[PDB]
Design a protein around this motif. Structure first.
Motif, PDB file in Angstrom:
ATOM      1  N   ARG A 175     -27.492 -23.662  -1.138  1.00  0.00           N
ATOM      2  CA  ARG A 175     -27.434 -22.591  -2.123  1.00  0.00           C
ATOM      3  C   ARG A 175     -27.259 -21.242  -1.443  1.00  0.00           C
ATOM      4  O   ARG A 175     -26.445 -20.417  -1.872  1.00  0.00           O
ATOM      5  N   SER A 176     -28.026 -21.002  -0.379  1.00  0.00           N
ATOM      6  CA  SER A 176     -27.938 -19.737   0.336  1.00  0.00           C
ATOM      7  C   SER A 176     -26.540 -19.527   0.904  1.00  0.00           C
ATOM      8  O   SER A 176     -25.950 -18.451   0.750  1.00  0.00           O
ATOM      9  N   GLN A 216     -35.171 -30.734  -0.184  1.00  0.00           N
ATOM     10  CA  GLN A 216     -35.295 -29.365  -0.672  1.00  0.00           C
ATOM     11  C   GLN A 216     -34.748 -28.360   0.333  1.00  0.00           C
ATOM     12  O   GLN A 216     -34.098 -27.382  -0.053  1.00  0.00           O
ATOM     13  N   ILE A 217     -35.018 -28.567   1.625  1.00  0.00           N
ATOM     14  CA  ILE A 217     -34.450 -27.696   2.652  1.00  0.00           C
ATOM     15  C   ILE A 217     -32.932 -27.688   2.552  1.00  0.00           C
ATOM     16  O   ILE A 217     -32.292 -26.631   2.561  1.00  0.00           O
ATOM     17  N   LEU A 250     -31.659 -25.774  -0.671  1.00  0.00           N
ATOM     18  CA  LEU A 250     -31.773 -24.322  -0.636  1.00  0.00           C
ATOM     19  C   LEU A 250     -30.857 -23.723   0.421  1.00  0.00           C
ATOM     20  O   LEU A 250     -30.295 -22.640   0.218  1.00  0.00           O
ATOM     21  N   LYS A 251     -30.675 -24.413   1.549  1.00  0.00           N
ATOM     22  CA  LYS A 251     -29.743 -23.915   2.556  1.00  0.00           C
ATOM     23  C   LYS A 251     -28.311 -23.928   2.035  1.00  0.00           C
ATOM     24  O   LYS A 251     -27.545 -22.990   2.286  1.00  0.00           O
TER      25      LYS A 251
END
Lengths: 30, 30
Positions: A20-21, A13-14, A17-18
């Protein structure tokens, strides 16, 4: 066990999301 | 202001997951 699966999921998950960011920041800058 | 709010939420979620991982890394010593 369950703990190993949850730490794998946390790391997945980290990373997601990283990623995606980073992509969003570049898209916004365009 | 919803776009700004959604980016803030993403950053909050990233920070939260990083904190979970960081707390586990800190705990590695003890």
């Amino acid at each position: 066990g369950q703990l190993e699966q949850e730490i794998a999921a946390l790391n997945q998950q980290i990373a997601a999301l990283k990623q995606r960011s980073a992509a969003l920041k570049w898209q916004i800058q365009g």
